[PDB]
Subunit: 310 residues, 5 copies
């Protein structure tokens, strides 16, 4: 029994985030526990203030006609509990539920260690014999609480795109809204556990540029290559199979080349010295001591600029 | 109370994919959130346009007789919410739910890094005292949305096999349809994380073909063999126990042989040189420098052609 | 309201497997999605063909008395949806649900890489004031579909033990049936990923029988021992803590001994040669080159026969 | 509507284990699927055999007043299905459900490889205006079935503490029972996968007591230390963070010391021999060959006795 | 139908913890199973002791008006079962449910191995046409049981902040309470499995300060660096991505520097000795034997004080 009306019915939405948690980088999903605030005019049950009852009349969801508001980018059916329905004397309904769903929003990993994200929450409503249009009442839109806790993320701002996008879908039009949660990753943990350890073993790796023993250099450069494969796997594990190149995935692949040409050096250093050309051997080795660090710091500047500076 | 009819009743199906996600390569399952569109003629409740009501009459699932449409290759009971039922004046019912199930479709891993898949969604319906036949209404079949996001996969096309397959099952006939989602894997992530790293350590592995120290060569060839076992496990983990040979599983097993005959070489190089036959030692070693790379690039051409080119 | 009868009521069961999946070797459980077919005579609602209605009368589960059929070796309550109830004119009820439960069937890992299993599905029914006995109707027992897909397993045959086992349990008798799914493991994946890699590193391990350098031999035999611990863990992970000895668990423990006596050799080879007895040193070492491979191939024949040939 | 009585009402409990599974050592929880048998006298509905009906009258849970029996040490709400309610003519009710919950019982890991456990199942009932007391009817208490399968555990005995413990809790008294499942761990799997492999690498570790090469000894003692860290982690993973010392955790920490003083030896052996005191070097080394094995076998006897023998 | 009142209604809360478990350090969540005790005066149903019935009248949740008490920092909807409702003659309602939810409370990992935590449980209630205020009845607040078992944690005290915090939220005021569970981590497990093993491999690492062989020192210092990366990962795994520095994360990063300057030493020791300056070589090496242990024990005192002593 939809409210008889002369033109499209406006449903007034508003989300109040109470809890955020479990941002799954692999799955590209997060979990929200918030308030949903719906309000529409249904003159069909305007009541008479003085003639009976009180200021506002409370109802159960069964009596009133309620607009079916579905979340779009959500895995299962939104898990909600009705908190209060309050009809105003003019026939204005005040709906308020508390829902908990896990939302499916894509993430951009192009700068995975240092990146910002804009999570999306989408609300749609379908029509029957009257048209429905959703819109945000900003006073119920202040989704954030001063206690929102998203582990490993900094919460910038929860806002809503005021203008809905109205599709036509299966000989009926629907109205979609875009609630946007903007977050930036807390990169600090990565430095003392990934970045700095990865560099250290790379620096050790070419300590063999001040050595002449092949056995001790192959032990050196190779054992550090193993340690880098460990970090490479440790990072590739908590990250989805992106079709592009991540920032750490670039530098982690760059490092792979510095272990190859280092292995190439100590090998070339060896055949050369064993072939009675040590004048060339100790000449190459000495250059490496400058070339490898410089090209590295150079390529990183090239790489870093190619991602962040552009 | 099934609709009394003169011949088999046609139910007109149509799926509209809203979300795709969680393609589990190990489990061989994906998760879909879509629209189901059913439509059948039930003249038993044709209504009179002018005489009463309006153009279209809305019902609750309890009143009308609804065809029981079950998904075949699905784990648990399909999780659906009814969106709208709309009976046309001639007695045509327009059913529309929004379901979310996880579907069980086999995958072909013969070319695991670079492969295409055709996922299946099957709909069946059973008969009672009249026969039922399903068929697709292509206007409700445009399953795709311009936002379908399947991580690590490119979505080619969602179509439906228009001709149903009608089995006889337990003294009653059923009608089955085949909705087909065609996808191709986003292989790019595999190159800088598996393929290229795997090759590098293999090339380093036979840098010992330019060396004479057994100790430094056994350190070399063996330490790289360990690193390959790591990658071998890393790949065997995100992949089911296929009864055939995967493409990477072939090349990853081929690599295992190149580490064996390399270990064989440095060993043969050593007994030989220690046995006062260095004329043969440095002769073998020099050939290896050409044989191993050539046979590898050859075997890969042989292997690659044996999988993709045929 | 159980059907008044003169003697024990026979309920006629029948399972039709639609999907099989998720055989958890660690948990010793699998997941089935099948049809349950129950049929019993309840003369208490025999209806009159000509006098009224039609050939067969359809009911809702609430009206009719339905026998409570419970699955025995199942974790939670079987998750079923009723498909159709059809009472025959003589008072014969045709019940048909579609259930999905995860079943708990023990597995025998004595030949873990190459083994066959017989999964069990048990149905019980309890009595009230009349006795109930279950029995299989073979035309509804053809559980298999030509699409049953059990990853990493070959499905041999789904049959049912026709004779029920009738216990007495808590001053009431119950009737139990045994549906049996016979499967054999798809061993092919194990060879290029476990068996063959494990052997290779073992053969490399005693390439040190053609060498005299202690440093290069301890690097050899020990580094391969590490790689074997990796495979040992990799296999012990996807396998339950059986109280017996598995086939691979035997050969994987046998391999552990060949790494010990090899380490013993190179060590004995060394003290000996360092003690100015190289006549004995190079004598032992040369025998190893034959003893180790022969004893291995011998012990495997002994072991293999002890498991499969007996 | 509780049964009006003159004194505390006795509810007669009884559990019949049908399935046991999923004993999580990390979580300290197991999962049970059993029968619950309740029986109490409610004279308020004692009925007339001859005057009407039959021997026993069957009811639905809604009609009768049922005692609210809650499980104590259980995570979520016990998941039960009612099997039969049968009121005896005197007003004696025979209740029988089939439940499936996961129970939270602490475990004692003091002898983790070889240990016995007593799992607990607790039933409580709260009072209203009459007092309730639970008690076991041993004829319904034979919880075990000849098919109970607890992977990696031997089931000794399922019994019940007949005398309930009656607390006062929030101005109302409750009655608690103690059902006890006694189990002993199947230790066999641990020997060929943890214990024996751990010892082997320790014995190899001090094969360097028959060697003079520092490079080959540091390769020896250290590479085996790495393998022990692997086993140390492999065991610490499937085990909770106990506040006491486990048996394997003791011997695994003892082994850590034997790798330290071994590294200390080869180091002391070296400075000494390099310092032109080989008379002392080869004297220490020779003693190690006896000291380390003896102290080990001694400390193990000391340790083993300190845990099991006391 | 809220109770008509002259001023804000006081609801009297009280939590009785029955089970605590599953404190997820990664997720920063724990799981509680407790009693909720609500009590408010609803004179609108005061009954007449003498005139009818008995001392206390028992109701079903449907009849009475019940205050909607929601948990704040909880993932999904609190899972509760009503135990008893008992209205007093003056119109005082005694509500008691048993709930089980998983709570989301932030943890402070600044001293991760040795740390104390204060878990939070928050209760809110919203107003309608009368105001509601929650407050604790300490006789129902004794949340603890003498059986509360939180694995790997010591439970200090469960208390409640008696003064509620009353926000205004969306043109309606809410009343929030703070129940506080104070716990301290059981650090003992960490010493024999992380701390002591980590130190041992570090001490072994600079046993190369009593050695002159580069090959044996690079084997030494590097192989132990690998073992430390293992522990570093083993610890970083069971710990969230904090934006600050943990205590073990500091010392584990400090250790990384001691492996770098040690690798720097043996390298400098080598170029020097190879450059015919052994007078400086054996001079540096001898100082290291004192510098490294002292600076370590010093830096730890500095670090430890910087975290705990301040």
């Amino acid at each position: 029994p939809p409210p008889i009306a002369d033109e499209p019915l406006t449903v007034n939405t508003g989300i109040y985030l109470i809890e955020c948690y479990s941002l799954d980088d692999k799955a590209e999903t997060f979990k929200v526990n918030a308030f949903l605030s719906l309000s529409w005019k249904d003159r069909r049950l305007a009541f008479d203030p003085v003639r009976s009852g009180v200021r506002v009349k409370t109802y159960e969801p069964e009596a009133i006609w309620i607009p079916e508001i579905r979340f779009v980018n959500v895995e299962n059916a939104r898990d909600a509990d009705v908190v209060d329905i309050s009809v105003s004397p003019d026939g204005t309904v005040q709906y308020l539920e508390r829902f908990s769903a896990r939302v499916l929003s894509p993430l951009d990993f192009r700068r995975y260690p240092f990146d910002s994200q804009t999570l999306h929450i989408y609300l749609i409503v379908r029509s029957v014999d009257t048209r429905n249009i959703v819109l945000a009442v900003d006073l119920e839109k202040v989704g954030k609480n001063d206690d929102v806790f998203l582990t490993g993320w900094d919460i910038e701002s929860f806002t809503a795109v005021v203008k809905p996008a109205n599709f036509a879908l299966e000989d009926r039009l629907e109205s979609k809204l875009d609630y946007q949660l903007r977050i930036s990753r807390q990169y600090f943990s990565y430095i003392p556990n990934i970045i700095l350890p990865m560099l250290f073993i790379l620096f050790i790796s070419w300590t063999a540029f001040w050595s002449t023993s092949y056995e001790a250099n192959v032990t050196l450069v190779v054992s550090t290559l193993i340690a880098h494969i460990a970090f490479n796997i440790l990072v590739e594990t908590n990250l989805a199979k992106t079709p592009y190149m991540t920032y750490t995935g670039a530098i982690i692949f760059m490092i792979y080349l510095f272990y190859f040409v280092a292995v190439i050096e100590v090998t070339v250093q060896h055949y050369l010295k064993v072939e009675s050309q040590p004048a060339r051997a100790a000449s190459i080795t000495r250059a490496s001591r400058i070339a490898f660090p410089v090209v590295f710091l150079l390529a990183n500047i090239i790489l870093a600029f190619l991602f962040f500076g552009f």
